[model samples]
Target: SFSGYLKLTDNVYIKNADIVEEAKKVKPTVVVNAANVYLKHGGGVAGALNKATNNAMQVESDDYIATNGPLKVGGSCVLSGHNLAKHCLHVVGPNVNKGEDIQLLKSAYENFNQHEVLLAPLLSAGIFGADPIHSLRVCVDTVRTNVYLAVFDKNLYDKLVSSFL
Candidate 1:
């Protein structure tokens, strides 16, 4: 099992596992969706979690954007997590092609409050094209409390943990 956690700085820990599977059986106060600007929970971690909640959260997300607005870099919003969690905070990460790369991405973790257990699928790792190790580093660097990263690949997890050491 690749369940052992690399105790990174502060309360952040990274592990290799399926967190959506983890969330299906547990109810943490918060889970993060590395969302698109449109707040559409159509694919990636967003879609996966939306699917886990019996397709309820996509509707929740649409309602959020229906009243609110699209999230740009450093923007975040929350909606009820249905049965999967108490709240799902959706964050829009950076493209890394722009100058505000790390800062924009850090806000993905930075926006949420401290002192609770939150599970975040490592963001900006797909589509946006940020370096995975650097993105993982920022993921560790930003958050606090019992935050766990459910990275899916063991070799990548191994590489990240080694980079930290």
Candidate 2:
């Protein structure tokens, strides 16, 4: 049940697998979401976790971090629902309809606290339309923990694996 880690750096480990499958396998203590500026658990990883937990405090949890207006591009927030993991790291990534802010993608990882095992989806690669390769690289560079990138889309997962070659 192990695909093996693609060593992105000394600390960061990339895993090209289904987000849900990888999460169940790794059981990471923390899971990250490429969140919307409003911090709503709408689509992508955020939506999945929200559905799994039956919307358990996801909005309320996000509200704690989103005391201000919409979250900044390079800013992050934290929530606790124990839905998909012990904690959720909600990071506001650049929306494709808005602008390109790769720095925000990188900051999401940079802002995370160290954990023995941390899992994140490819930030902004889905609806956000950010360059998958560039965003993935930044995630590799910025992470400070044993990071695993759990990609849900099959085509995207294959692309990531092939890119290493």
Candidate 3:
């Protein structure tokens, strides 16, 4: 879900778990095979921690505000989570404070609206030790258009997203 302009102040930071780096070495596990390339922060850093995509327009997570900046979505810390498959792809952002979190999230969606996205696979952050509600917020905010949240807890998944929708 990496899309538009990524702005981050020096105060912003990204703290990721060890697994995030481990996932990095496994190259080509997931890639956008397009001429236009895009950059993404896989584990919560701002901007392009690593670059990918053929052309570069189709970035993974664009406009990532790294540290404690108000524009941040996730936060400056690596939270270990599980990958349902060999690789787990998450559309996450930097972590902002309380009231500010919503504002940053809104900006995330606004930025995401611009790009011609290639693909995205979102999951509950709680599974990876992040706040469930906050994680869900990221998913919904990013996917106001096409959100197909599959839940193992059939009851929970349907009930939650449906109610929100």
Candidate 4:
């Protein structure tokens, strides 16, 4: 069952559902990605966006990073043409074995300092292997925006629900 609403702060909200489904709801003004410096769409949420856009995402991502350079582990790259949203904000999360790089992850959110109405999945978890709770905490702490986090994992969702309630 969906938890429906889990608010960390006035601006940050967590919803229990597939990230893709949650993203489709608002067609959010900005959709954030936990990617690599190279901007390759191999797995995790990046993979989903690549699939949804039928490879346009990867093309645009590569093109953007090519001119701008590989994003730093916490740096952000914005690109269009994926048709997923108005914009896609890509951030190179910490490598899976390295554990969570909080500073870099926080940098990723800080880049969105001017943005509002953003959508982000449970970043750096799964293949990236960060702690979902810690990552979410940093995401909320750094970005001052109306954030809707996509919580698809039941365990993570439960933890979030429990944390707030």
Candidate 5:
């Protein structure tokens, strides 16, 4: 799965990151998430973004916006706005109609700083019942190698997919 370096600027691959190495890095304040996730005007996209930016926090995702999720990836979008959170970077996935899967994936992988990356899940977006593994694959195989999975299911630990990480 290794792609050799090219002076002409060619393909590359992710280097697996160790958990202990991650643990040694500065950690975010581990807040106990013990509430039901609800989507609404009082607590949906606009609201979350508002709170996060005001509090100087950064929010993320593993899926496209299901509701009014203002934060999104893909579509050649980049983030910029005061009181709007972190310096978001857009990583548009392949435009299958444009025949750009490999190129898109390579571009995204190249943009990702694996050692400084973190990821969370969207358990609610499993339209094909394959979202969990599929999203994980996208992150590890395409997006980045270092991920901090914030999952709600113990079953995920039993899955063979994580062995790749």
Candidate 6:
């Protein structure tokens, strides 16, 4: 779908970040931790955040699961990040095992609007098995705040930029 960029501001749309190295001091006040239904920081963005924050992501996510139980697909939880950001939102996305539906992906992105400045990765694009381009498109349609996309893949970043521009 070419209906991307409806909510994104013109200048701050995309970024090329490794996430782990820059997530702590990134310009955005809130960073997205794309989590699973169990809120485990096993891989993808969650893994990077855990590595950067010295397993704080893992520890907090474990506590979150213990308290709130398993988050449903398209549900969200927040954590007290250790200098990672003012808030670290853990959004559960639909995985390939469940058929990788875009509606659930859109719902996962809907939680991002609560913050004025949000930095997010391509949710479910890596291990969860959502197509990267489709995930980026869904992100563009849903995120309404001033947002920066920290896409780890440079080629996908450029492709998205071309489409947006």
lDDT of every model, 2 decimals: 0.74, 0.69, 0.29, 0.74, 0.31, 0.74
Error of 1 at 106 (Å): 2.0
RMSD (CA, Å), each prediction: 2.9, 2.8, 13.6, 2.9, 11.5, 4.8
Candidate 2 lDDT over 10-109, as tens digits, reads: 7666665666556656556777777786777777777776776677746575666556767777677667736466677777777766766666676666
lDDT per residue as tens, model 3, 46-108: 122233222122132333223322222432211112221122233333233222233343443
Give, for candidate 2, the lowest lDDT window spanning 10 residues.
108-117
Which lDDT value does model 5 have at 122? 24
Quote the lDDT for 15 in model 4. 76
Candidate 5 vs. truth: CA RMSD? 11.5
**Ten residues in sequence with the least summed lDDT for candidate 5:** 31-40
| C-alpha TM-score for every candidate | 0.85, 0.81, 0.30, 0.87, 0.33, 0.86
Best by TM-score: 4
lDDT of 6 by residue, 1-165 (tens): 111222345424666667665565553467788888887787778877888778877888788788889988887887876777777888888887668675698888888877777777777777888887788777777777766777777787777677762
| Candidate 4, residue 113: lDDT | 71
How many residue pairs in model 5 have overlapping backbones? 0
Clash totals for all models, in order? Answer: 0, 0, 29, 0, 0, 0
Candidate 3 accuracy as TM-score: 0.30
lDDT for model 4: 0.74
When summed lDDT is taken over every stretch of 10 residues in candidate 1, the lowest stretch is: 94-103
